[PDB]
């Protein structure tokens, strides 16, 4: 996250870290949507241009974390995966259209003060809240600078970072890139003229873009960090998978698989 701030303890209890067993490295963010289902971006698992194709046996999810590198004994829970489900029409060849994947955990995690699921939007929440100028919140352990991420403590944070960003109008999103954008994507960020800055960046993929409903006080996950050209560049915006537009596939998988 570029130009964010350290998250508060318990601020995003649905935030999940996707972690590779060997070498032990952080792959992506993800989010907890029930005691056994994690949502992430499909390119975190499958992206043939970079020879990426992970099976469930390669991965661990770590839930309840705050520090990026520490094993948080007695706070975080680590789970293995039972199955991974990539959207059948994920388009990795051209524009990462339908960038979404579900991961089923081998056993339910117990909730606690640091571990709690986020809600998934219904048609009416998506309708009221996914409007240009309305702000959402992005979280992750990714790079703090476009040029500087590597590890150690260069542009890589000690704890979870958070940034709040406005949704941008679809025209402005389309005219900032040469990539073909679809109805399954939205973009967010500040315009050059707005003075504030902020963006997700490398290592934040798969993480949640969430909004808090003013009607019932609950947090809803509206997007998944998907792609961008650089991080926090003037006139460029981060793109996010539109979770409500792919909600029928989500429901289908959970109803058919547990």
């Amino acid at each position: 996250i570029v130009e964010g701030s350290d998250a508060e303890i318990g601020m995003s209890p649905w935030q999940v870290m996707l972690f590779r067993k060997s070498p032990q490295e952080l792959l992506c963010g993800a989010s907890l949507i029930s005691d056994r289902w994690v949502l992430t971006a499909a390119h975190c698992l499958l992206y043939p241009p970079w020879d990426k194709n992970f099976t469930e046996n390669d991965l661990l999810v770590r839930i309840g974390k705050h520090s990026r590198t520490r094993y948080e004994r007695n706070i975080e829970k680590i789970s293995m995966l039972e199955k991974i489900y990539i959207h059948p029409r994920y388009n990795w060849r051209e524009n990462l259209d339908r960038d979404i994947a579900l991961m089923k955990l081998k056993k339910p995690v117990a909730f606690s003060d640091y571990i709690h699921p986020v809600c998934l939007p219904d048609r009416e929440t998506a309708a009221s809240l996914l409007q240009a100028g309305y702000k959402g919140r992005v979280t992750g352990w990714g790079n703090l600078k476009e040029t500087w991420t590597a590890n150690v403590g260069k542009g890589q944070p000690s704890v979870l970072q958070v940034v709040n960003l406005p949704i941008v109008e679809r025209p402005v999103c389309k005219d900032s890139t040469r990539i073909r954008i679809t109805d399954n994507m939205f973009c967010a960020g500040y315009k050059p003229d707005e003075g504030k800055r902020g963006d997700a960046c490398e290592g934040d993929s798969g993480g949640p873009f969430v909004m808090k409903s003013p009607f019932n006080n609950r947090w809803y996950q509206m997007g998944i960090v998907s792609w961008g050209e650089g991080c926090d560049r003037d006139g460029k915006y981060g793109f996010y998978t539109h979770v409500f537009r792919l909600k029928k596939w989500i429901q289908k998988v959970i109803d058919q698989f547990g």
């Binding site: 606690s112 709690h116 702000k135 919140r137 406005p166 003013p214 006080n217 947090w219």
Partner: peptide, 29 residues
């Protein structure tokens, strides 16, 4: 489903607000 989804143990359930959530609610005009 997710009957208790989106209500945080250390914030909503205790009626405490985090440090920047008002910025989000102030933009929902």
């Amino acid at each position: 489903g997710e009957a208790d989804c989106g209500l945080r143990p250390l914030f909503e359930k205790k009626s405490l607000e985090d440090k920047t959530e008002r910025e989000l609610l102030e933009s929902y005009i």
